[PDB]
From a paper:
[name] is a pyramid-shaped trimeric protein that localizes to the ends of phage tail fibers and functions as the phage's receptor-binding protein. DGR-programmed variation of [name] enables the phage to use alternative Bordetella receptors for infection. Variation in [name] is focused on 12 adenine-encoded amino acids that are fixed in position and scattered across its C-terminal region. The 12 variable residues are organized into receptor-binding sites by the C-type lectin fold of [name].
Numbering used by the authors:
A (entry chain B), B (entry chain C), C (entry chain A): 5 to 380
Write the structure that this text describes.
Amino acid sequence: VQFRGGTTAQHATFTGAAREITVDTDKNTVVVHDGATAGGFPLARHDLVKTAFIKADKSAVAFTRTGNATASIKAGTIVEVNGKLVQFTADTAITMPALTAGTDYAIYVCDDGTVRADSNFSAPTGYTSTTARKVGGFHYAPGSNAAAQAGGNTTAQINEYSLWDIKFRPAALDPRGMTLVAGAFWADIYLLGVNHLTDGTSKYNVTIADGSASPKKSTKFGGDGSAAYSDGAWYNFAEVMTHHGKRLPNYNEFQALAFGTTEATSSGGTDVPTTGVNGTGATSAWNIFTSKWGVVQASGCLWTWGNEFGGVNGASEYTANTGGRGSVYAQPAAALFGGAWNGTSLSGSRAALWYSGPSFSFAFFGARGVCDHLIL
Amino acid sequence: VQFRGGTTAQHATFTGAAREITVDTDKNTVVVHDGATAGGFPLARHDLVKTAFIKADKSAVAFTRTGNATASIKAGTIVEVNGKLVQFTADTAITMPALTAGTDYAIYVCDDGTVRADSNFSAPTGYTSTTARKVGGFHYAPGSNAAAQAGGNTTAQINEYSLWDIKFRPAALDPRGMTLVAGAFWADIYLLGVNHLTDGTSKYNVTIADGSASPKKSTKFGGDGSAAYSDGAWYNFAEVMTHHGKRLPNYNEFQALAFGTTEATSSGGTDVPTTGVNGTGATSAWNIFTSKWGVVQASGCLWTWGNEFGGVNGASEYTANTGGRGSVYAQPAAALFGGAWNGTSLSGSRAALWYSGPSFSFAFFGARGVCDHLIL
Amino acid sequence: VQFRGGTTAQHATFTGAAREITVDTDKNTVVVHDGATAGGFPLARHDLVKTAFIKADKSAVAFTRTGNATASIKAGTIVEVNGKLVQFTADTAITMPALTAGTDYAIYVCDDGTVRADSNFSAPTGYTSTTARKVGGFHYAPGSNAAAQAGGNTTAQINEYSLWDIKFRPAALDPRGMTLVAGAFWADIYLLGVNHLTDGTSKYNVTIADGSASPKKSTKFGGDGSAAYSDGAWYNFAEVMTHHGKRLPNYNEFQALAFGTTEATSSGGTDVPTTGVNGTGATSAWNIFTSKWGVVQASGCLWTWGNEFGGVNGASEYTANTGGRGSVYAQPAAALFGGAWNGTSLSGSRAALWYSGPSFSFAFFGARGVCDHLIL
Ligand SMILES: [Mg+2]
Ligand SMILES: [Mg+2]
């Protein structure tokens, strides 16, 4: 049984009858007619909505934290997956696996109509990347967010602001282990690791990069993949953030990301070698330094290099101190934020040092990444 | 009447005949056939195109200002609304309500085909938020944009540059009261007001937040809703902007946004308390200071905190002047731009003072929000 | 041959038998029925997927460089065009026109299903802009990208990093002549030219705008189209980049964009007047200074104004040197990056001079443009 239609050319001058239906054999699609309009009204093929993702409210993430280890996908969420339409007419709970503290999770909507979370970032368990479509994700943090200005506990839970969908996410290449600050931008939850190449910039429980344990050399910038930079200069940390589509914080970004940390306090001890854990001889616990947004070790554990210049200038005369890539002249200091483990009273969300030249390297100087917030 | 059916599983290994129409009982959709392809060619369900919005020219707003109190939606605009498709094949006038000077309006495309503007940002008069879709809006200014470099006048009219649509808008979380500057970025039309929590950062005829009468404390940073900040520190304004997903203008931004103001001229008198009105005992009228882009009181009224550090340094010794959030060493000044009522002939689009540290606070230091331009 | 359908009102409370097809005369669309659900299942009109563009991997450009003068469109690409659906199920070679060194090309997809490049940015030869759709583009460079840190050659070829599609492009208002740096942002390939108004900012083999040969006044800021600026001031270059929706680079950006250049080397000679060719009396070839991402004359040719302030301040009193647009107090120098031709061995990817005020101008002070990377 066949309905006669012709080419798109044929259809162009053809006017079907009110409620008549022809077939465009060029497009392979149905065309509805109204008995008055030349060409009719072609319908859309499904190939042209492949990957559609409609949220009821586009200005907020697609999910909700319902408990410490539970989350729901919001009502009104329409999702194309593997030729099929999956939609949720009411808030729907997301099936979780086991949740280890300090790990990242991806959220999948599957072609059977079920929504599941998983530690794997290609496909969840018992599905392929064709049967399941990754739509978002979250971080399962070691501790809670700062309920006020004292920090948070050490109850492992979902970081409410680490929730991202594919149209409400960090601008950077990989969205993992970042958190939405004030709904304005994204900050790395953890300070930059040494193995940022395999781990990402922001990972829980890894060696923190500093003047000594300097970061792996960026492969985008002539790094071989296991070699590290010879020092912990600003130049080096700035190079690393670029490689991951991020930048160092500015003052206004820092004072914001780190709010909620315990002010004018430091980790104490002789070192903070590891993200999310207590420092070597720490006189106060890591979670005392946890922002309102779940930025871990926000302040007073390690100075982060910044992306702003000013303060104390170097020699008013050309100096070749740039890892042998040119010379500086009257070179202003590159900001350092937060304080480190050993400035007791000095540390905090607005703590700022404008003395160090960008070529300076010390074991109190690391970095935290940021990037824009993109809503689509 | 009922057509040859089958499940997606069944459709998979089935080749229909040229112009045969089958129904996929799983997908609930029509499938066109060509007598050649396995599985045929499934059509798209309308849900997967919900909220669609297609512009003819994607790098321009969807509307044209046609006169002081009239504007039109451009030809080629296709809007999905409430299951319906509404489109404008020619330029169509937008139905205006009463327009009061210094008001923001929203533009709605209704399912009955009409396009109207209303002061209400949820639904126009005699429509539900289902039957009408908000697609953009504009600001009805209290005066003209600056034709030359002598400011504008006092004739209420649509600021042409203030037109935004859902895919051509300020990146900020709320589009109201902003104006697009040289198609590069968005700027607040008005200086930051005290009650920015209920008014947004930019609003006509409100009290201008300054060092004395400072801004309401930010909800997202531990404000309660009634509390003001203690003073008008750079730190505070910076934080108020971050709240609304805006930031302070940099030098390049400022010089762009303020262009068209009457250069080397100040308001005179003793104070500027209100946005969009004349200053207290002022010597030249407020519109003298309107920019090419409809930025009201662009210069020579209040200094605006910028987002750039440099110039005169504070003490070369840690100082706890950050409202109790850490200490600062050799802190460079936060830039201020524009000049103020007392500024005499120093005011203008490139007026810049690199003196005050971020901790300073005066009755002639305020702020203006800027943000990114979003084209989708 | 009619199908019994009615209005949307009517459809609202109606249930067809499983596989009954009706016509919504309001929406002019087909409605599938299941036997259970009221209102049925309205299908999507083609209008609502007009301009659709679907990549298999959204985080990468849609094309692949296959050799010096050949490229393919990636498998999985789906393009709506002129009411039709063109789609590439495997890597398909783009049809190349005649390739000339230092020219931008636009990649089109056409309703006859063919994919071709062309120097015309409206339509390829033998098509209207209705039958062909601009989807991407690239730069045919005068030399090669930097293999390591010695620069490149003079073999004309496709700069692989200059590939852009409509959902993977410079945020700038016009994507021509840019190249993506480490996947984080886009940088102009060429130093800003005098006739940027008609050439864009980044164009091969034109006069490089400097202090003597100042650029043309932006028509967005009072320029007429003929008039040049009186000097090569930071203020002016900054104005020019705003006009084109770009920024002056920052330090983190510059070290990135210029990486791969021959470090500690300058053009030598007396002057460098033209983009992409050797300087007047130069002692090193122009391609010696070609970056990893094919930034041409990246360093050691002209100081490029930066978008950072710090270093040497100026008169600690209100000076009016902003070309009549107000006064500056204790004005911090504007950064200058890369070094110039005279600079000798100071020049390089990190060469930075914080001495010159924003009002200074010299015949070795130019600019390069940058903008964000847009992914959709
Ligand atoms: Mg800056
Ligand atoms: Mg600075």
